[PDB]
Enzyme design. Structure first.
Site, PDB file in Angstrom:
ATOM      1  N   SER A 265       0.948  -1.084  -0.103  1.00  0.00           N
ATOM      2  CA  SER A 265      -0.006   0.085  -0.114  1.00  0.00           C
ATOM      3  C   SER A 265       0.923   1.417   0.123  1.00  0.00           C
ATOM      4  CB  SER A 265      -0.928   0.014   1.199  1.00  0.00           C
ATOM      5  OG  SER A 265      -1.994  -1.201   1.253  1.00  0.00           O
ATOM      6  N   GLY A 266       0.524   2.090  -1.000  1.00  0.00           N
ATOM      7  CA  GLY A 266       1.456   3.476  -1.091  1.00  0.00           C
ATOM      8  C   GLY A 266       1.361   4.224   0.192  1.00  0.00           C
TER       9      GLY A 266
ATOM     10  N   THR B  72       3.554   3.793   6.140  1.00  0.00           N
ATOM     11  CA  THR B  72       4.609   4.711   6.429  1.00  0.00           C
ATOM     12  C   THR B  72       4.252   5.585   7.532  1.00  0.00           C
ATOM     13  OG1 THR B  72       3.924   6.121   4.561  1.00  0.00           O
ATOM     14  CG2 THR B  72       5.724   4.771   4.358  1.00  0.00           C
TER      15      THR B  72
ATOM     16  N   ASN C  81       2.301   1.469  -8.845  1.00  0.00           N
ATOM     17  CA  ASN C  81       2.663   1.974  -7.876  1.00  0.00           C
ATOM     18  C   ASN C  81       3.854   2.992  -8.605  1.00  0.00           C
ATOM     19  OD1 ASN C  81       4.138   3.086  -5.378  1.00  0.00           O
ATOM     20  ND2 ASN C  81       3.400   1.480  -4.305  1.00  0.00           N
TER      21      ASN C  81
ATOM     22  N   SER D 260       7.799   1.999  -4.352  1.00  0.00           N
ATOM     23  CA  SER D 260       7.737   0.804  -4.423  1.00  0.00           C
ATOM     24  C   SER D 260       8.809   0.240  -3.239  1.00  0.00           C
ATOM     25  CB  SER D 260       7.284  -0.050  -5.118  1.00  0.00           C
ATOM     26  OG  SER D 260       8.473  -0.055  -6.093  1.00  0.00           O
ATOM     27  N   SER D 261       8.541  -0.126  -2.082  1.00  0.00           N
ATOM     28  CA  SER D 261       9.611  -0.713  -1.185  1.00  0.00           C
ATOM     29  C   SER D 261       9.914  -2.089  -2.183  1.00  0.00           C
ATOM     30  CB  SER D 261       9.084  -1.111   0.206  1.00  0.00           C
ATOM     31  OG  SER D 261      10.132  -1.567   0.939  1.00  0.00           O
TER      32      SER D 261
ATOM     33  N   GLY E  16       3.407  -7.002  -0.053  1.00  0.00           N
ATOM     34  CA  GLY E  16       2.497  -8.380   0.152  1.00  0.00           C
ATOM     35  C   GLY E  16       2.342  -8.944  -1.313  1.00  0.00           C
TER      36      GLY E  16
ATOM     37  N   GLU F 195       0.851 -10.339  -4.730  1.00  0.00           N
ATOM     38  CA  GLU F 195       0.293  -9.596  -5.989  1.00  0.00           C
ATOM     39  C   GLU F 195      -0.363 -10.520  -6.959  1.00  0.00           C
ATOM     40  OE1 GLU F 195       4.155  -8.135  -7.618  1.00  0.00           O
ATOM     41  OE2 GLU F 195       4.403  -6.546  -6.539  1.00  0.00           O
TER      42      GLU F 195
END
Lengths: 714, 185
Positions: free
Chosen positions: A167-168, A172, A212, A215-216, A438, A440
């Site tokens: 989730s963007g 955070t 996104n 993206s981590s 997570g 996809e």
């Protein structure tokens, strides 16, 4: 009573009992309020004749009875008589509408991004959760942070926070809030320090994704260490499996980590003068594969942020010019050229421009580097012999070198952050904050998606094991004799083809070793070993007009379709130890520090599996506490959340698996007095020996257990 | 819905869609099986190759035609060839297309009976039909009257037609064709 002490946020935490009492007594029917599908809502309430604005008549074995108006706002969907998708969907929808972004889901802690500033966290007036339990206080993540604190102080066992990361937003901000809270309760601060050097990670481990733009692409395991008694100590950051395959190959309509274009934005002509590098991105194949830039972010100001990060970091002038030089060399590798020697076989170089560039940059020799790339040596017992190399072998080795350099630099920078952010007495315990992507499900899934889904299968099995042992303990506590097949692993242990030594990954490695292997042979091998012999392995239903898949895996979050085109080239990882030995002698001291520490069999999948094993090994020694941040809507307008987005997320986030398991209860767990009171219209022994089935309940030591589908009758 | 045309023949399969100008797939009607040992562990050995894949690997295979003289004499191999034709060459689903097979005149009844049984059971075609090769050749020639001499790989036959009427007592079928010339050569 215990709600009016939170002030202006109490309405968000727990609604006043007046509107609650008027809402918990709505007169409605059991057999004319069900749930039917839709194309834009996918789930609707209606009155088989059913209408709420449009008439639909569907089969009489697909309607879901809507939740009773008693529980229409409960922040814990584990007690509902109707555990189905639309039930929890509209539960959360209402709880967010009448603003309450916090919820509990069996064991999860679902938070929704409100997009509207709220004093629901600041000030400490809401942080009174100290000493308070989850089962009594409102459902805040502060309760979970406090619970982890308490468990550390009473159990001497580390704790872990697994926050959903694809989730963007929401994730955070929640990380910031939980580190702030942990500073607050157990009080140049750790929060300041942690957010200072973050631009480094932002530039190095984040890339433009199809779904996104920040993206981590790795796992961040922030350890906030605590003293012997529970006093805040230093906090080190630990990184886990990183998608290193991107450093070379990017799909169409994506691009690799931001740092490359950040540098190549020509913001500091000093750099693009030092690295012998122009500014046109379409000149370097390692970056010009997909799209060179997105319009949703600048590169110059982020470059300035990363510069200031290196400054606030303990880096000197050399520990920064060296990093820029290494990135320039990683770009210069992409366009080295080799040709088969005339008339026999051998790969030889044609033109050494980028060769000399990279050789000067990393601090090596050019002829020595070319020779070590075309003529890698090996130790045969006690002697060395040259090994031949074709063109494709040289290219594979170049890619492997680039990936190794990038990962080594990343890990060294993280160690430097751990150093500059650590100074404290020898402490005992810590809390785990796990940031990771997570599950996809895209329109075109590939190797990377497979690896990510495998990791998430592992994490989900971890959560299932934790929740299973919890429920089993609680049953042995109330004397309720009830044993069931392990709800922890026996679900995904069969969807662990991917690791067992005949599944997809072992087959892919075998095909990476075998002569003349191609994608067609890989597909054939997959089919011969699994098609028909496994139930989770299925052939995709490829319809003309949609992207072609090759096989389908029945994951916990649905059945995903994969397209194996190109997995062979993407899995190969042959490291060239001669060039690594050259690196160990470089003049650029950062490179020699990187490669300071009687081979051709290396694959991305193998390193990935080993890293994942290590990560799970770390987690299996602590106590987990899961959090599910959600993006409610895509248009950024707060208040209203789109239903298909949140439904897909509730699938992938992992809550629906917990719901599906607790449905095998006995989800509804009440004591004696509440049922003695609310259903006395005629303790619980005679009150239920009168009517239903005798197995829907199991009384023990002032506890009644009800299976899903009984309070929809009362 | 469009229909399939599957002129089988004894030396070449010609398949396609009803309405085109030329067959979409033309490959040898042949099935090959490996005769030698097989040593490389993990090479992914197939049991049998069909079509022109069996033609490029023919150095190590033993080739067999499942049709000798217009008659199908190996129904498993013929089922393999039809499965190939539908799924790998034409890339369709036989459950959605009527199929027009073709046969030579004056050959046993069991041939057509097994053809239609195979189609309807192990392929679930919606409908089918079995024509005579000479009549179709006359259609393609753009005539309604003439004596057509068809000569393929297995059988040579004459069929005289007049004004669209066949003379079944004058049909003459001869059993030397391309394959007997290949053997004589």
């Amino acid at each position: 009573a215990q709600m009016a002490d939170f002030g202006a946020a109490a309405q968000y935490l727990r609604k006043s009992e007046k509107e609650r009492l008027e809402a918990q007594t709505r007169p409605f029917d059991i057999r004319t309020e069900c749930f039917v599908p839709d194309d834009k809502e996918e789930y609707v309430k209606a009155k088989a004749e059913t209408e709420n604005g449009k008439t639909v008549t569907i089969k009489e074995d697909q309607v879901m009875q809507q939740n009773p108006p008693k529980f229409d706002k409960i922040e814990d969907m584990a007690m509902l008589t109707f555990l189905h998708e639309p039930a929890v969907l509209y539960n959360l929808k209402e709880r967010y509408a009448a603003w309450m972004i916090y919820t509990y889901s069996g064991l999860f802690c679902v938070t929704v991004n409100p997009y509207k500033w709220l004093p629901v966290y600041n000030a400490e007036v809401v942080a009174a959760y100290r000493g308070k339990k989850r089962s009594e206080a409102p459902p805040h993540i502060f309760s979970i942070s406090d619970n982890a604190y308490q468990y550390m102080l009473t159990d001497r066992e580390n704790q872990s926070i697994l926050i959903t990361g694809e989730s963007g937003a929401g994730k955070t901000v929640n990380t910031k809030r939980v580190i702030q809270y942990f500073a607050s309760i157990a009080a140049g601060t750790l929060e300041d320090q942690i957010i200072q050097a973050n631009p480094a990670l932002e530039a190095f481990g984040n890339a433009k994704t199809v779904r996104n733009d920040n993206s981590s692409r790795f796992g961040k395991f922030i350890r906030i260490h605590f003293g012997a008694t529970g006093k805040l100590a230093s906090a080190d950051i630990e990184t886990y499996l990183l998608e290193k395959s991107r450093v070379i190959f990017q799909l169409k309509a994506e691009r690799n980590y931001h740092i490359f274009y950040q540098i190549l934005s020509n913001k500091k002509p000093e750099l693009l003068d030092m690295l012998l590098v122009t500014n046109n991105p379409y000149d370097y194949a390692f970056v010009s594969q997909g799209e060179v830039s997105v319009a949703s972010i600048d590169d110059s100001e982020e470059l300035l942020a990363t510069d200031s990060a290196f400054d606030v970091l303990s880096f000197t002038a050399e520990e920064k010019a060296g990093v820029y030089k290494l990135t320039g060399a990683i770009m210069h590798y992409g366009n080295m050229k080799f040709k088969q020697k005339q008339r026999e076989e051998q790969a030889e170089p044609d033109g050494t421009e980028d060769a000399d560039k990279s050789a000067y940059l990393m601090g090596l020799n050019s002829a020595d580097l070319l020779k070590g790339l075309c003529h890698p040596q090996v130790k045969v017992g006690n002697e060395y012999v040259t090994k031949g190399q074709s063109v494709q072998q040289v290219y594979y080795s170049i890619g492997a070198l680039a990936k190794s350099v990038y990962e080594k630099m990343f890990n060294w920078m993280v160690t430097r952050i751990n150093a500059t952010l650590e100074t404290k007495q020898p402490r005992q315990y810590f809390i785990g904050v796990l940031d990771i992507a997570g599950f996809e499900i895209f329109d075109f899934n590939s190797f990377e998606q497979l690896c990510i889904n495998f990791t998430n299968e592992k994490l989900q099995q971890f959560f299932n094991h934790h929740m299973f042992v919890l429920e089993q303990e609680e049953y042995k506590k109330e004397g309720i004799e009830w044993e069931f097949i392990d709800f922890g692993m026996d679900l995904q242990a069969c969807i662990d083809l991917i690791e067992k030594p005949m599944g997809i990954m072992s087959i892919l490695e075998e095909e990476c070793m075998f002569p003349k292997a191609s994608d067609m042979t890989f597909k054939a091998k997959l089919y011969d070993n699994h098609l028909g012999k496994s139930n989770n392995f299925q052939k995709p239903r490829n319809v003309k007009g949609k992207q072609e898949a090759h096989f389908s895996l029945v994951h916990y979050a649905g059945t995903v379709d994969y397209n194996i085109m190109g997995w062979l080239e993407k899995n190969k990882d042959p490291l060239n130890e001669t060039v690594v030995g050259l690196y160990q002698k470089s003049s650029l001291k950062l490179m020699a520090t990187l490669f300071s520490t009687k081979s051709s069999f290396q694959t991305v999948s193998a390193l990935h599996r080993e890293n994942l094993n290590k990560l799970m090994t770390n987690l299996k020694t602590t106590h987990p506490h899961f959090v599910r941040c959600i993006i409610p809507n895509e248009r950024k307008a707060p208040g209203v959340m789109d239903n298909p987005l949140v439904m897909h997320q509730l699938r992938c986030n992992g809550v629906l698996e917990g719901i599906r398991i607790c449905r095998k209860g006995f989800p509804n767990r009440i004591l004696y007095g509440d049922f003695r009171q609310r259903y006395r219209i005629l303790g619980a022994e005679k009150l239920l020996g009168s009517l239903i089935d005798h197995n829907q309940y199991k009384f023990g030591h002032t506890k009644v257990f009800f299976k899903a589908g009984l309070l929809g009758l009362l | 819905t469009t229909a399939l045309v599957c002129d089988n023949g004894s030396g070449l399969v010609k398949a396609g869609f009803a309405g085109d100008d030329a067959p979409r797939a033309v490959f040898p009607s042949i099935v090959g099986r490996p005769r030698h040992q097989g040593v490389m562990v993990g090479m992914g050995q197939k049991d049998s190759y069909v079509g022109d894949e069996a033609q490029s690997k023919r150095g190590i295979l033993t080739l067999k035609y499942p049709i000798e003289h217009g008659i199908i004499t190996n129904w498993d191999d013929m089922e393999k060839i039809w499965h190939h034709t539908f799924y790998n060459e034409l890339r369709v689903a036989p459950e959605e297309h009527p199929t027009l097979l073709t046969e030579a005149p004056l050959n046993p009844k069991a041939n057509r009976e097994k053809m239609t049984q195979i189609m309807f059971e192990t392929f679930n075609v919606p409908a089918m039909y079995v024509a005579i090769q000479a009549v179709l050749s006359l259609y393609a020639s753009g005539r309604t009257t003439g004596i057509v001499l068809d000569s393929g790989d297995g059988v040579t036959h004459n069929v005289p037609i007049y004004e669209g009427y066949a003379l079944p007592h004058a049909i003459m079928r001869l059993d030397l064709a391309g394959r007997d010339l290949t053997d004589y050569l």
